[PDB]
Structure 1
């Protein structure tokens, strides 16, 4: 039989919905079909997410894919904790131990805590957008105490799009007073291109400044603009294009027309979209494991109402969540392995750095080991301290 799922998509997640249907057609098998019912909304409306998630819970789904915001993570992780319907998502990893939520976007907390150690920073600004938890900021003020850091955090996500140029020019003049030669930009793409336009337009991308774009999509925004000048930026990459699984995808991805797959005719995928391709791999492997060990399941005759009095559990959902957590696929991001909660364990995040040639990977981070240097002991195997023949 085919398998009914739900898709919670934003009105504006174009490339992700393309990379949803790419994983639909490639991972499909004649045994079972992962046939969705796609709904469009904004994730800034808990009224919309509730009216969609109840409409999907009414329309007999066995799992739901979707996105969320700060404005809807608590609408979701209470609903999926209640109605036992599992949920697979590429949004920001929730701060807790929530059941029936599968996080495809890993973590960068200790990784960003690893990198600041690697440069040995002690005094640095930290521009943050609200936009997804605030759990990085809490982690880098928790650790800022016992590591002797002087974080100057600034909320930067309150800025409207007509007083943009005035405030950022007002903003970095404050950090110019405190001799802030290090920034972190805990933003997303649509903001972190705006901030690198303003540190260009006031000319703070010279030698001396140092940046970290603490996203998992370092090469998804326009770093060609800041690529010269002397400001040594850094970053984090999960979609490493030097791989066989990736480069074979970039073949068929770059050949898609932007009429039935809009925003797909390109050579670089957003890490929001790359996990959307990765998540359909995760369902189809687990729903294959459902029919494999003879756990064959029916939905209901009616599926009730979401706001039933009382709204009841259903024991076959206990199998589906446990099936979604035993997944050992390999996807675009690398090793997809979950623990008992739905968060990623044993994954690899590649510490980049932007040089004049371009993006230049000089390490990786894993949960188990550390921030691990990949190769190049010295830049071209130089510096060899010396040998002094003294007496």
Structure 2
């Protein structure tokens, strides 16, 4: 009795798709199996996302796993909410009310604000990506007013890959001489290297505002002077993660691009966890004996059973690669722990952790 689902993947999201496939193997049973229909697309393109969503809807999927970005997030939220189709995603979380969107990614804003306070910063630069969310911006600016921080908030997004050289000049002119060397980097991974390379030096302290501090070669040179801190939602010392890596480290690269390593990007980890969440939801519908096509149809015809699937998804409580997984009624992660990292000559290390209830705890 196969369960039809959609998968909407950004082009080039190879490791995430490998993790998706490994999840389907691990969490599928003999009798029950998810049957995904995959669309690879440019997620920044709202026309393309709308077309992919509608195609999935017309097929008759029971839920959609996928990604969005700043330009397409409203298409996903509005279409899911209108048609009662659940969208499970590792993409950036949103603060508004969004029925039918299950956001695998923990919120990071609280942990970031606690870390700023932990280091007792009162003046710093916040370099962010207009090609990314803005909830974190808002939260930082709003806290600055309350905490009396002096924040220099520069949208490093939309760089022509051209004037880039002449734009970092004006960037660092403001910082370098305002003797501002405390810097938060809240952008796409590549933008990190591009900014750090422009600095090279040891008097700086960077906070990397993402959930994958040790992901990829991001830390390509640990001998480089300068304090670097960040966040980690995948704890490689946890039993569940260690067992996963025992397999992931042995996979064939040809079959599973991005695997055959001892680490996994946090977005890929969340993708694997999303498969567990979906499988558990549908299994729970079966246990409870709950039996379960034109996008532009007027009037809109929402899926009648949509609310039952949405409910089952939000009620899932399991441990995964990203730790304890539990959702509130708005599809937001709750009761999750985020590990706080720190830079050392020999590598990264967990100095403490953050939870909603306790804020920051030092190890």
TM-score (structure 2 length as normaliser): 0.96
Displacement after TM superposition at 1:131 (Å): 2.3
Change (3 A) 1:305 1:148: same
What is the alpha-carbon distance in structure 2 between the residues aligned to residue 163 and residue 12 of structure 1?
A: 26
SS in 2 for 1:25: helix
Question: Does the 8 A contact of 1:188 with 1:215 survive in 2?
Answer: no
What is the alpha-carbon distance in structure 2 between the residues aligned to residue 345 and residue 92 of structure 1?
A: 15
Question: Does the 8 A contact of 2:353 with 2:362 survive in 1?
Answer: no
Change (3 A) 1:224 1:96: closer
Question: Does the 8 A contact of 1:290 with 1:296 survive in 2?
Answer: yes
SS in 2 for 1:212: strand
**What are structure 2's unaligned runs of at least 5 residues?**
none
Displacement after TM superposition at 1:170 (Å): 4.1
What is the alpha-carbon distance in structure 1 between the residues aligned to residue 233 and residue 90 of structure 2?
A: 13
What is the alpha-carbon distance in structure 1 between the residues aligned to residue 45 and residue 116 of structure 2?
A: 36
Change (3 A) 1:120 1:295: same
Structure having the higher Rg = 1
Displacement after TM superposition at 1:166 (Å): 4.0
Question: Does the 8 A contact of 2:90 with 2:267 survive in 1?
Answer: yes
Count the aligned residue pairs. 362
Change (3 A) 1:165 1:248: farther
Displacement after TM superposition at 1:228 (Å): 2.6
Change (3 A) 1:207 1:33: same
What is the alpha-carbon distance in structure 1 between the residues aligned to residue 263 and residue 218 of structure 2?
A: 13
Q: Give 4+ residue runs of structure 1 displaced > 4 Å after superposition.
A: none
Question: Does the 8 A contact of 2:132 with 2:187 survive in 1?
Answer: no
Deviation readout 1:327-386 (Å, 9 max, x if unpaired) = 011100000000111000000100000111210110111112111xxxxxxxxxxxxxxx
Q: How does 1:331-342 map to 2 (within 5 A)?
A: 331-342=320-331
What is the alpha-carbon distance in structure 1 between the residues aligned to residue 268 and residue 193 of structure 2?
A: 18
Question: Does the 8 A contact of 1:189 with 1:220 survive in 2?
Answer: no
What is the alpha-carbon distance in structure 1 between the residues aligned to residue 362 and residue 313 of structure 2?
A: 66
Deviation readout 1:143-163 (Å, 9 max, x if unpaired) = 101101000011111212234
Displacement after TM superposition at 1:283 (Å): 0.4
Q: Which deviates more, 124-133 or 34-43?
A: 124-133
Change (3 A) 1:163 1:264: farther
Question: Does the 8 A contact of 1:235 with 1:352 survive in 2?
Answer: yes
What is the alpha-carbon distance in structure 1 between the residues aligned to residue 362 and residue 90 of structure 2?
A: 61
What is the alpha-carbon distance in structure 2 between the residues aligned to residue 190 and residue 286 of structure 1?
A: 36
Displacement after TM superposition at 1:226 (Å): 4.5
What is the alpha-carbon distance in structure 2 between the residues aligned to residue 224 and residue 70 of structure 1?
A: 26
Change (3 A) 1:34 1:145: same
Change (3 A) 1:193 1:221: farther
Q: Which has the larger share of strand?
A: 2
What is the alpha-carbon distance in structure 1 between the residues aligned to residue 139 and residue 358 of structure 2?
A: 20
Question: Does the 8 A contact of 2:132 with 2:188 survive in 1?
Answer: no
SS in 1 for 2:272: helix
Question: Does the 8 A contact of 1:216 with 1:237 survive in 2?
Answer: yes
TM-score (structure 1 length as normaliser): 0.89
Change (3 A) 1:165 1:226: farther
Question: Does the 8 A contact of 2:3 with 2:34 survive in 1?
Answer: yes
Change (3 A) 1:221 1:192: farther
**What are structure 1's unaligned runs of at least 5 residues?**
200-205, 298-303, 372-388
Q: CA RMSD in A?
A: 3.4
Displacement after TM superposition at 1:229 (Å): 4.0
SS in 1 for 2:126: strand
